[PDB]
Subunit: 380 residues, 2 copies
Amino acid sequence: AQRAEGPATILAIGTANPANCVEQSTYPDFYFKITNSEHKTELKEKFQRMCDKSMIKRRYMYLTEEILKENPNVCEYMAPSLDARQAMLAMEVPRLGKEAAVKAIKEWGQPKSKITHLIVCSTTTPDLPGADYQLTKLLGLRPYVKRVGVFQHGCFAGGTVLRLAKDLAENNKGARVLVVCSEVTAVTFRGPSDTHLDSLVGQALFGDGAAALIVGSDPVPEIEKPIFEMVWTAQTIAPDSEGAIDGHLREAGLTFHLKGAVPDIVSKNITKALVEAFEPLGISDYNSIFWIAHPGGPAILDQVEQKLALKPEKMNATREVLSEYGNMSSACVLFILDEMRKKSTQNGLKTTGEGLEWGVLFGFGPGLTIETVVLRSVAI
Amino acid sequence: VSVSEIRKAQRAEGPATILAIGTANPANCVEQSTYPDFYFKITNSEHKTELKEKFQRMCDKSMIKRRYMYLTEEILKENPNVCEYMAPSLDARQAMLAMEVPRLGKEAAVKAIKEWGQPKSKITHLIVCSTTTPDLPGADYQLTKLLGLRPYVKRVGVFQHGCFAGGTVLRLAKDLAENNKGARVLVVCSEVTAVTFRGPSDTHLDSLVGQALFGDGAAALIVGSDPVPEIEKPIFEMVWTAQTIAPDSEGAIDGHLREAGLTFHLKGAVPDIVSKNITKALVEAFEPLGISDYNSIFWIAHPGGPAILDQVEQKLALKPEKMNATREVLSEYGNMSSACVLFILDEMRKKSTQNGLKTTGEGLEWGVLFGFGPGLTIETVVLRSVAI
């Protein structure tokens, strides 16, 4: 009587962001000023076009004007600054993650002493113990909670944590898994450089945020309220994409090397992933399922939409999150699930999935990995 | 189709079982008896006569005969900051790990797959563990590339967990294999001291003890539920798992990844904390089985240090033979972090076969595996042996 009976189900969702709201319209002037680069006028025009095409209205950042003034080495492009950044991360990642987790637990409505497993995900973690240990302490969870830390996986990790939570919940009766994704740009922020150009795109897209979930099989009637059910999962590496998205954790912090073929590679490989997931269910109409896609950038969304001839409405929840929060790495897809279920309830639809039955969630990231998670909605 | 019908046809049936084990170590073998002279010379610290005496004592009582290290005198001579106690050297260490962790891990994996005997294309999941990883993609990606596994292998990287992670990967493999029909999980723990090696300091004796104990190595396993009779060959079966944090131990073992690489800091007495919390971990795991005599089960314990083994043995009044397998690995390889407990499982099963015992667990039926590490974490895995 140790294994569970039904499908792993999402029972709650909560999110959080740093208090500092940064409007995109005025970021270019701010960015080039704080990094003492107002004189490279031309390079500011390149960044100007990147922000105008980003389709982002605002982002939230732990890094404030004061903190940047406190750390000149972080404002240069490549200066020794890892130690300073690790200190910021050791405090903020767990704090922001706790804020989101508290809201998820409140929605769930059960004692925190009932949480049996914990999965914590962040692009990087500064020490040993990892962030999972820190969050266990800050939330006051059972000392014997089973922990798993997911670090340096990157932008596709929203799918990864769902994939892990599914097996932990389904193979253990009574198991209730707290999942937390917390991302903070203190590890990636740096000054502009007309040489390292691709590093510039991250400064125009990346933002801060955290999202938490409670996942479990065999929901208790009325006491717990299902939102979405997980059905099948997969992970794969796109062919001829090595180096498409690289990252290096060094003494100058974390630097990225993402080329311009990214949008092309993702969209060209999206069809195979969909067939692998839905052909077994006899589903061929991709406008008949609800969508959740990691908004790595606007181009990825435009080409997937064009490639499959999706109605513009399919990418709505995804584009709404990109517009109001920017690219929060692993946390994005979880924010999108929240936006979709809230919007559906708001407009009086019949299911948490915009009134539809089946859906799909995609994570995209380093090693040009594509994570796929098939979902099913819940009535009303 | 309904989700219910899908779930029913998706799950596996029996308990996760270890089907093969393989290990590997760097080619450079370092004798312990003469390490003090070697270490103080390469770090240009021969004028620290008193400090060297202390280190000689540490090495003499470590119960380690030798270790294998990727770091050689030639490499050390090319990286001057790596020889200092705390100088800017992370970038150089990252380049070393980027190559060695995946290379050493692949060597062990090839041996495990050979024993298993089945196509590499049938591996559905991959778990790679290492104290740290230098880039994005993580080491799990590189191993997949080096081995040529199917691109759709489901991967999970376990980084910055530490010395207790040997238990962590078994705990994860248990759920991945048991909840997915046909799943075959390749598990790899690869540890390289290039990330922790540093010069001696008379104000950081805890860092120095680490220089006397840590060694390099990798271990690989194939784990799966529902073994094909007479084709696949079960070695050990997993029964139950647990993880806990010892009370009042925050600070006992901590590491920091910084510009000077990875450093460790201790607080209190680790051996005492482990030995005082071990009985409760055992009672909770074996009470349900009706076992109170710990000399009646086979043992696998993370050899963090010789003192932990001595105190555990004394606390439970174990016969000398109980720790044979554990002490053999500590003696022949040193503390290889997460990989240790996996080397011990291999030693125990090989010796049981060699000396004619009736089960892979020294002729006994039940056994236990313990992992100890940062945030004073204790991982417990209950095991059942296999006949002959």
